[PDB]
Design a protein around this ligand. Structure first.
Ligand SMILES: CNC[C@H](CC1CCCCC1)NC(=O)N1CCC[C@@H]([C@@](O)(CCCCOC)c2cccc(Cl)c2)C1
Ligand SMILES: *[C@@H]1O[C@H](CO)[C@@H](O[C@@H]2O[C@H](CO)[C@@H](O)[C@H](O)[C@H]2NC(C)=O)[C@H](O)[C@H]1NC(C)=O
Ligand SMILES: [Cl-]
Length: 337
């Protein structure tokens, strides 16, 4: 085909990016994260007990209001690092952008307060491969490719910096291609290590000039559902030590007044140096020496098979517009704008 649909994304404080999909007939709208690190679609169910506070404060899907709804009922449990949800499988029509696909998804009936009482979105749309799909449910992008409507079998992410301004696009995904209005120059392409996970090799990670970490190679998951860049505890410990950063309960901080003069951090990908300055990775609420400012980087120990691995989240994708290419099993980076 020749189609490329775009989906507008909301940017909440430069930490949560999500868009909107419609489920059912007539369509019930949900705010969802589009997550390349996972492969299942799910939203909270009307059958989720209000005993779960997350299901009081988020949109629920009511199967009995959709004429296109088709019952399945098989149990589903999804364990992410940050917490588990459970429920059962349902089939219905899902619209994303201008596209409309019949999709199997989770109706979630168990939804823990941590982390979901902190979620500004209702559910997630996993943009990963069927290899990572729990229950081997066919991922939504696979079902879209099957339609043969897409100009190209790729999708791309633009995440924007948060702006007080009313308009200001928080972010954008394109199904079928990439929007040259939000990247300059050409895509540098890097092959996946293997099909089945949006992960590439990384030759090193530099702090300042000294190529300090990952000196002899490591993995990089390009993860749109991740808010910060993550590395292994032991990598991150070193990195934070280099920066003089202090470990708090939920984050790493520096004195705000010194954030600006902290060193660059470069990720060596596909033969090229991808650099983030301290302006890229410090949340500079102020520049006072009496306040502490959060870094958009933290530790996450991801278990095998996928880990140990770094994850390149929104901190990274903000600077580099990212194209996920399913036809060629590669990822492209171009400077964002
Ligand atoms: C596998 N991929 C990475 C994984 C995805 C995540 C999707 C929702 C359900 C759980 C798994 N994110 C992840 O591990 N993060 C670190 C913990 C906080 C997340 C996150 O910041 C993500 C916000 C949306 C995306 O922003 C870019 C957050 C905050 C509050 C509540 C929840 Cl629910 C999740 C980002
Ligand atoms: C829910 O989905 C499951 C998984 O796709 C369906 O189970 C499969 O159904 C097909 C068609 O009858 C069988 O060929 C497979 O062997 C089934 N998988 C197995 C081994 O369980 C199930 O039928 C769906 N539920 C309903 C009632 O539609
Ligand atoms: Cl290391």
């Amino acid at each position: 085909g020749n189609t490329t649909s775009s989906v507008i994304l909301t940017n909440y404080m430069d930490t949560q990016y999500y868009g909107e999909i419609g489920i059912g007939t007539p369509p019930q709208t949900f705010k969802v994260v589009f997550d390349t690190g996972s492969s299942n679609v799910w939203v909270p169910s009307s059958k989720c007990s209000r005993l779960y506070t997350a299901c009081v404060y988020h949109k629920l899907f009511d199967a009995s209001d959709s004429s296109s709804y088709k019952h399945n009922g098989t149990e589903l449990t999804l364990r992410y690092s940050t917490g588990t949800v459970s429920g059962f499988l349902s089939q219905d029509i899902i619209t994303v952008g201008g596209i409309t696909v019949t999709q199997m998804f989770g109706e979630v009936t168990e939804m823990p307060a941590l982390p979901f009482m902190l979620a500004e979105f209702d559910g997630v749309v996993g943009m990963g491969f069927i290899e990572q799909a729990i229950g081997r449910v066919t991922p939504i992008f696979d079902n879209i490719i099957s339609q043969g409507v897409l100009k190209e079998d790729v999708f791309s992410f633009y995440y924007n910096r948060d702006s007080e301004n009313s308009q200001s696009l928080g972010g954008q995904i394109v199904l079928g291609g990439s929007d040259p209005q939000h990247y300059e120059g050409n895509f540098h392409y890097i092959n996946l290590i293997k099909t089945g996970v949006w992960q590439i090799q990384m030759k090193g990670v530099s702090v300042g000039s000294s190529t300090l970490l990952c000196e002899d190679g490591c993995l990089a998951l390009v993860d749109t559902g991740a808010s910060y860049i993550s590395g292994s505890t032991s990598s991150i410990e070193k990195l934070m030590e280099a920066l003089g950063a202090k470990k708090r309960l939920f984050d790493y901080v520096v004195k705000c007044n010194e954030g600006p003069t902290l060193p660059d951090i470069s990720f060596h990908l596909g033969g090229k140096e991808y650099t983030l300055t301290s302006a890229d990775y410090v949340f500079q609420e102020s520049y006072s020496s009496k306040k502490l400012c959060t870094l958009a980087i933290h530790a996450m120990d991801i278990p095998p098979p996928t880990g140990p691995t770094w994850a390149l989240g929104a901190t990274f994708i903000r600077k580099f517009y990212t194209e996920f290419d399913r036809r060629n099993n590669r990822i492209g980076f171009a400077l964002a704008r």
